[PDB]
Design a protein around this ligand. Sequence first.
Ligand code: 3PE
Ligand code: SF4
Ligand code: SF4
Ligand code: SF4
Ligand code: SF4
Ligand code: SF4
Ligand code: FES
Ligand code: ZN
Lengths: 264, 178, 126, 112, 205, 101, 103, 96, 207, 114, 115
Amino acid sequence: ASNLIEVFVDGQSVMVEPGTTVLQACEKVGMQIPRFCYHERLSVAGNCRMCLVEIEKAPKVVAACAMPVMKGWNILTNSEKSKKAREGVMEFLLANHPLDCPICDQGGECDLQDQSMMFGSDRSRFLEGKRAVEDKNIGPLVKTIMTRCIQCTRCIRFASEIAGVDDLGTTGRGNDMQVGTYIEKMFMSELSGNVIDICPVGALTSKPYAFTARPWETRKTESIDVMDAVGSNIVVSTRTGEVMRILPRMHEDINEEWISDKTR
Amino acid sequence: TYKYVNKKEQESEVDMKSATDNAARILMWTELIRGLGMTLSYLFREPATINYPFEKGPLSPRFRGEHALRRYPSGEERCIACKLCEAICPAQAITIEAEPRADGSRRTTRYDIDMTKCIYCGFCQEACPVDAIVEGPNFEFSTETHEELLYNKEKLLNNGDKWEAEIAANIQADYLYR
Amino acid sequence: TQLITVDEKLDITTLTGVPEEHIKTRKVRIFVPARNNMQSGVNNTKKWKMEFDTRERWENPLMGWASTADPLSNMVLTFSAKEDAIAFAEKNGWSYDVEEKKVPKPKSKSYGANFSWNKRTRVSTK
Amino acid sequence: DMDRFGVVFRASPRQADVMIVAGTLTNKMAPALRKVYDQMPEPRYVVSMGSCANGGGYYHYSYSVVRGCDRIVPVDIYVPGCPPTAEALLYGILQLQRKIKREQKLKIWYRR
Amino acid sequence: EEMLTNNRIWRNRTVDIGVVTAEDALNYGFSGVMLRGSGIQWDLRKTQPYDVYDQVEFDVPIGSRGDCYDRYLCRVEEMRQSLRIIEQCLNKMPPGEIKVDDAKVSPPKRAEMKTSMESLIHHFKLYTEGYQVPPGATYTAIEAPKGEFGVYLVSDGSSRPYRCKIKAPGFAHLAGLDKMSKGHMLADVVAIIGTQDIVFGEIDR
Amino acid sequence: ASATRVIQKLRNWASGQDLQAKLQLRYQEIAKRTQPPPKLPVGPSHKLSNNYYCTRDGRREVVPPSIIMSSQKALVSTEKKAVTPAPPMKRWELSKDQPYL
Amino acid sequence: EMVRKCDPHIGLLHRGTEKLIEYKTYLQALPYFDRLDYVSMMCNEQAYSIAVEKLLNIQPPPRAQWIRVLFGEITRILNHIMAVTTHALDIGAMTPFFWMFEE
Amino acid sequence: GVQVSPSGEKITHTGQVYDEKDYRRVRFVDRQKEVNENFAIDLIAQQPVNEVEHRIIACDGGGGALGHPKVYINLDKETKTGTCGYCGLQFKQHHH
Amino acid sequence: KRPTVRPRSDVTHKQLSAFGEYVAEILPKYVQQVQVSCLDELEICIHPDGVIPTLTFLRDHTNAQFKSLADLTAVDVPTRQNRFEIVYNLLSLRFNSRIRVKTYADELTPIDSIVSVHIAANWYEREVWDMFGVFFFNHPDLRRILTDYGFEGHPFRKDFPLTGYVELRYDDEVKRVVAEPVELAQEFRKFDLNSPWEAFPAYRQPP
Amino acid sequence: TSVKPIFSRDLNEAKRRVRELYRAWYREVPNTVHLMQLDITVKQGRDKVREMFMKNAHVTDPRVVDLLVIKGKMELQETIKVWKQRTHVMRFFHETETPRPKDFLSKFYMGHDP
Amino acid sequence: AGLLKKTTGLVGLAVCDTPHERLTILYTKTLDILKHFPKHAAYRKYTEQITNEKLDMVKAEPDVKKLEALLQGGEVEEVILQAEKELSLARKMLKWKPWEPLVEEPPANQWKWPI
Ligand SMILES: CCCCCCCCCCCCCCCCCC(=O)OC[C@H](COP(=O)(O)OCCN)OC(=O)CCCCCCCCCCCCCCCCC
Ligand code: SF4
Ligand code: SF4
Ligand code: SF4
Ligand code: SF4
Ligand code: SF4
Ligand code: FES
Ligand SMILES: [Zn+2]
């Protein structure tokens, strides 16, 4: 009544405010649509095209991360067209991705792995040669290995909209698009270690935590930070009576998903 | 389908010949003499006994015995601390601690195997994506002490440097079947 | 066999073989595990967990492994709601400190905001 | 062939000289094992066969397993495997033979 | 068989010994030879087949007197029928692959893991996390050489089973010992322990 | 095989069988220990066309069980006929080669 | 020597398999079924695999099934050997044990 | 190499050795400390740089399915040398 | 037709569903939530007051001759107030069909035994008691079956630690095997393995 | 507040059962210190019986009491019959368990445990 | 005619020299007892169906073997055993009275899986 509108998700109905996206509605009915570029706190960007769904009686697929929801739209999350779109996007993402999982600190907690296992195919028809990119050096905290970037732009949008640096971008075009700086420049702000958290594919990793463990080993203890007086919520990962790292928690009132480099 | 093992017996017909045959069987111990003959035949056969420890029992390349960490022909270690071996080891016998080697490579500091927990299942060498951890052929590695059976990185590396000439050939033989 | 008037609080300690130590001196934690920020998956933020207090872990002199005298060091129970976990804890005689569930707040999002005439939402990174 | 080496399974502990712990040792069975060993007459040796007996093995973290027979009895030789190849158990028997080759008891008595 | 079958001592030890009626067997929960030696027509390889069984011919041996002798004969003849089956399995063995061609359940080959990204991911995950199994519960049983071996497997939507009970042939067979031993001596009790093909790794487990 | 035409006769008579044709020992009648290399085949899901895992996903064709006589919810539950869980098991037939051992 | 009651006291070989399995994955739990009945291993692996496949809704391929049957029957032979020969031993006959263990 | 400590104990390739005051050295009394004398770091350093005329080279190690996953290495930075992540082999752009 | 997926026949589904209707309308006083699975298996859930009548009917009735008790289990689900889900898997040799009957119990809510129906259940009910703590009625000899002779606890309860609370050793002082509190040289390592991405949308739990 | 009773419709009948069990144990102790050749007196055994009984004196639900009595009768059976050896009987006395003190300060000096 | 079979295969199962009479006895007894049941009870209707069907089969075929093949119950002695079992069950069900509303409904989420 208060400008809400009725919409369906595989028949199930839900009333959503105008401007709401397909993704937010599918969430409002408990469904989580795949993602590599939408992060819930960053400007929208329809790059990965992994959020593709079909709308009933609609020919093509829409980007649920950016398409606002219209009245009476039925959203088919688990139909043939959506599945095949996801499989195609996974083929494309993994075409030029390096066989580095067993040396990638992101192993076991990689969104690419889990989304390939849950939404993609189990084979490769790529019979060609992959590419490679010369790694940057942006400081002593963030390790850059850019053969693994899936060009999601999260690092850029975060640096610009949340940290306020505007020193990261995309150099070049086409398949040779090189995310990063154009010159050697240390990206040492006080909200820099969160780019590690929002890079899903291990291109950006913690140099301290490099190689020291794997996510399944760690036991996760919910605690808080003390370096400041904000009271940032954190998770403390331990491995056989030893602190391995500090990883943030979610608290929309304090530290939505961020923490300072001093804290982590 | 089915068959009978002890219902073959049909209605009883008896003659003097049959009675006398059963009587001889019961009085001269026919059926036992046959077991005696079998045991006799076995006395004049060649025994299957091998002369251990000089001549030994056969085996196959796939035999999974003692563990060893291998190397590339350059001498560099194959392990990269990916930890699949300890993630799947269903006995929780493997223990690993990694750290950036001075040259920057991803390598281990700890790699321990409680060979009192290993069930010798082979999952670690089929999980290793670099054919580093293997289950060698050696089975004659008994000890007088429990502690000796708790291998570390140096022990496994020495075993690898001791059996490579055999491990590598058995691999070369078996790696097409996988 | 008709009904009976018990009229008291449940107590199962005496039937569980749990020592006085691990009932009186134990503080259970009831919570919904927080999402791992290395991932954008939200499927482990659904079921309520029950976790016990952490105790000592000392290196073994021989090898250097982690040892414990805590049997419940790795005890984890899964519940569909908060009252179920509270009931289980009360029943088994444990002390608990509950932690409400953290749901993200719904957020307005627009792809046009990135392209604006007068606001600061205007982004320079397409 | 065991007897080829002089080895003979006698069923009474009062006649045996060694016991091979050939499998998993539960808490409900440890008293009987210690009793039998106690009932074996000195000189008495023990051989742990497998990974269950040495350190519990595949059932190490169980509530009903002793993490090693070496907790209940003293062990001379440990034979690893799950299961140990009979060839390996024989290797262990001969290792025990040699250990006995190196007892030097009367020399000690004479040195006392 | 020459040593045993027609030997009057083996017979005097295994004949009219440890007798089981068919109804008592069914009730007590017997399975396999402990069921056939009594004359019950039942075999989970012809009924409820679980593999290329139903493509391979073989006969079920059946006893008349539910004694240790008929069970021994059933076992010998089951060995002979196993030879009959092995002959066919040898002569008609098809070409092809050995593990499901679905790399989200069965890991991919090494040469494909070391060149294909999807296969490497799937290997990594199957060997660290495993494969998620849709919720549900089964009771699958096979004709193990002891009898009906079954597993009741409960699954959440996870990589680990929530409950896995093993139904062992030998639990009920041993439960039936007090009955089958009634009116018998010690040596007969030994023979009865033997005729049940008792193994305790499945009974105690 | 080392036997010498007399022990063989003796043990064949004692056992009543022709053992020399069926020996408990393996004399070069076995596959070698060094075989050539194999070339294993590949399964059907190795194509490059009409191979989408959404078609060959059996792990996701599962469905929760069908519900009858759910009292707490819907689907609660001439005269009908007495039904069976299945038709009676047929009677077996005794073999044609050796039905009476 | 006439028996009036048998009270089997099992449990001297309980290990907690059914609980460790809960603490393992499926592959990571397979060897328990080999270790359960240790004379008819492949059959237990086969039962476990068949159950897991039912839950997964997959079908093993033909060659694999034929191999499963082959080795299942080989295990039947193993187990019947062991049964018959230990039966005999516990009854007195000792040679069949030695004759068939070579096989 | 295998260097010794003031106590005589050898320092492993992990940099580990017991301090002179550490009681844990009794386990090595009347016995030995097992170390691996072939340090892989020195060995892989002793190997030479493999030049190449292509800007992007692959490395499977050696033997194909007997080595490591095939990774591709960029060689634009003429001062540096590209090092495989699995093995330690170095590669350099020959023509720069 | 597809070689990886599993051939599915609806005939068995129909047979078992019809028989489930049969059982439900012939035992309304006890039956709850009959159901059949994608894999062809019949599951009949009941009130525990109906255990003996249901099992006796399924054994003795003519169109239902489930007179072999394959298994008898329990399942701890600490969430629900009645944790233990007791399961009766049965078999008909006359129809070559199986069936599963389920009840529910609690730490302080025992049920009746079925040894009057299936003698195979003596040891299975002893096992349930030893492992989960469920008490049965009119059981001839209800004691422990698998646990040690002085063991405290019910180990298959999810609340019971995998490694237990005590640990055994031999002490020369007393010359006996004694029980001491647990203390491990290597602590069992708990691996969090659940993927955070929904895997089967057919089982999605609506909020 | 309404539930099904196991045996006792009230705490008094459960107490009757508990007393029967106490009598059984009190009468059995001597026979099992004789048979098992335990190296303790008959008074220690009965003190231990009374202590194990008081260990659960705080209960008020008749169902918990009924189940405790069932367990006690199970143990008394295991003991009357010699199914359990002197080991399991002397497990009750904890002759080797170093007794942790209840003094806050000693618990502070040895370890971080409360 | 077809003489009393020398023996069944099942152990402890004696041959019946009056198989057609025992069956009639048992089925008529079952019917006579099923009348004390309420007429709306499904047990009564179903069991009457089964018993009258088998009774007509018996009255239509004196050949014991053709009867076996026509009755799908194995040997004629297994059929008699099952007849007396169904009779005892009829008595026990007259005692239990299962043709009544559900005694108690389950708690909210007792059969929810997963959970
Ligand atoms: C005009 C003539 C006047 C003279 C009068 C005499 C006329 C000749 C009469 C000949 C009689 C035959 C000789 C008698 C000896 C045999 C006795 C006998 O038959 O006993 C049989 C007994 C029962 O066998 P069973 O099959 O169980 O039948 C049970 C009954 N329903 O079972 C047994 O007793 C045998 C079982 C024993 C098993 C132990 C192991 C035996 C080992 C066999 C070794 C053989 C070597 C012999 C060496 C001898 C050298 C000294
Ligand atoms: S570096 Fe990481 S966060 Fe930045 S665009 Fe690439 S994948 Fe996204
Ligand atoms: S980002 Fe993910 S898929 Fe890519 S190498 Fe790392 S773990 Fe593997
Ligand atoms: S063989 Fe199996 S049990 Fe042994 S270390 Fe490897 S994975 Fe672990
Ligand atoms: S699987 Fe191989 S590379 Fe990975 S940690 Fe184990 S030994 Fe090292
Ligand atoms: S074979 Fe393995 S599981 Fe079996 S007893 Fe030996 S070590 Fe234990
Ligand atoms: S989530 Fe929509 S394009 Fe990336
Ligand atoms: Zn390389």
